[PDB]
Amino acid sequence: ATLKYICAECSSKLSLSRTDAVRCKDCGHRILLKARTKRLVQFEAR
Amino acid sequence: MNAPDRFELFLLGEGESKLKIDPDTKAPNAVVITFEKEDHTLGNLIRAELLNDRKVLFAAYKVEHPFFARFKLRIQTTEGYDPKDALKNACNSIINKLGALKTNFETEWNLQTL
């Protein structure tokens, strides 16, 4: 539910510490993406 | 970015009244009604109706800049006729004209089947 990152190759929910380097645990591939804020954005449908 | 809010087109601002009636500096018995938050939907209609009043000498309207929803109506009437009245009468005449039209269209619509 409460993550930090997501692998771009295998669309997989992840989360790791900068003390534990980079890359996907159960995929390999070194990519990674930040994942949407739960902050919630409101748009004028204009 | 430097554009105004689209409601500035129909919403009156800080203070700001709809009609500002100012006496004409030049010719007598004439006046300049500045209609705030208005276009050609109202300008032309009031103007053309005023031109039917066979006691109104002059009646014209202009929209000085397109950026702004605001128009200037100039009215000149015969001695012993306040232009404020000439407008009042014009306005009234339009409501009545439109009244009939609603009633008529309504009538005809009911007779139509689809």
Binding site: - | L42, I95, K97, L98, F105, W109
Partner: protein, 266 residues
């Protein structure tokens, strides 16, 4: 009935063809403007996006949602939130719709205007049900999703006039022609060798008496009798477009009449 005369030739669920006899150009035109702009309607004016894993941008989706036509029948018994007392919106000024769709099927999943859901208590008002004229029952196609994708969002539909955003138009096109014989000589037809053979004559030529070739020009004639066709988008039925058209125009004249009376005191 006394003044201006209406003669409906054709009428449908979303189209009315008629003639407007005994009227001034200004009135005919002003009606056409008020029908385009100044009539209030309900439209999504706030999308709150929880999830969006579609190929489309959040705002790109929000934009389409605004354009989606929805019931504006009992729209006169919904308030402009601007003049409502609530902090933000409520039930007296807004309609709250929901959209949750998840591409679950192996095939492409289509999101329709049919898939929006009212969550606001309507208080028995005919309002904000996405208007669906489509044969198959689906609305407007909003989005598409692959097997993976999900789109979770909330919509606040609000009262507004086309004059603020084109989405609020109960509008569509309005046909408008007067004097299909140019008897008025109200336009000078451009030609190479012949004005008559080169310009195609109107559907409305049947309804008028063709000129008179070797006859004097009617200098005193005033443009009257207007051939019109009003198309509804669907939010408000056709009869109501013109009835509310007449009405709102009549209203703004009355506010200008009432305006005079306030300056009259001091």
């Amino acid at each position: 009935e006394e003044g201006p005369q209406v003669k409906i030739r054709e009428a449908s669920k979303d189209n009315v063809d008629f003639i407007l006899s005994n009227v001034d150009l200004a009135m005919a035109n002003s009606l056409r403007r008020v029908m385009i702009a100044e009539i209030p309607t309900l439209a999504i004016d706030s999308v709150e996006v929880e999830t969006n894993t579609t190929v489309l941008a959040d705002e790109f989706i929000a934009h389409r949602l605004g354009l989606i036509p929805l019931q504006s029948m009992d729209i006169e018994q919904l308030e402009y939130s601007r003049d409502c007392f609530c902090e933000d919106h409520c039930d007296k000024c807004s309609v709250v719709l929901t959209l949750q769709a998840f591409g679950e099927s192996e095939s492409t999943t289509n999101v329709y205007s049919k898939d929006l859901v009212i969550v606001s208590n309507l208080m028995g008002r005919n309002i904000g049900h996405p208007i669906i004229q489509d044969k198959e029952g689906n609305g407007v196609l909003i989005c598409k999703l692959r097997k993976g994708q999900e789109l979770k969002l909330t919509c606040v539909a609000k009262k507004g006039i086309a004059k603020e955003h084109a989405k609020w138009g109960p509008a569509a096109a309005i046909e408008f022609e007067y004097d299909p014989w140019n008897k008025l000589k109200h336009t000078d037809y451009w030609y190479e060798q012949d004005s008559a053979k080169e310009w195609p004559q109107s559907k409305n030529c049947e309804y008028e008496d063709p000129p008179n070739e070797g006859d004097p020009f009617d200098y005193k004639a005033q443009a009257d009798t207007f051939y019109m066709n009003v198309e509804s988008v669907g939010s408000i039925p056709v009869d109501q477009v013109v009835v509310r058209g007449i009405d709102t125009l009549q209203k703004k004249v009355a506010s200008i009449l009432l305006a005079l009376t306030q300056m009259d005191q001091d």
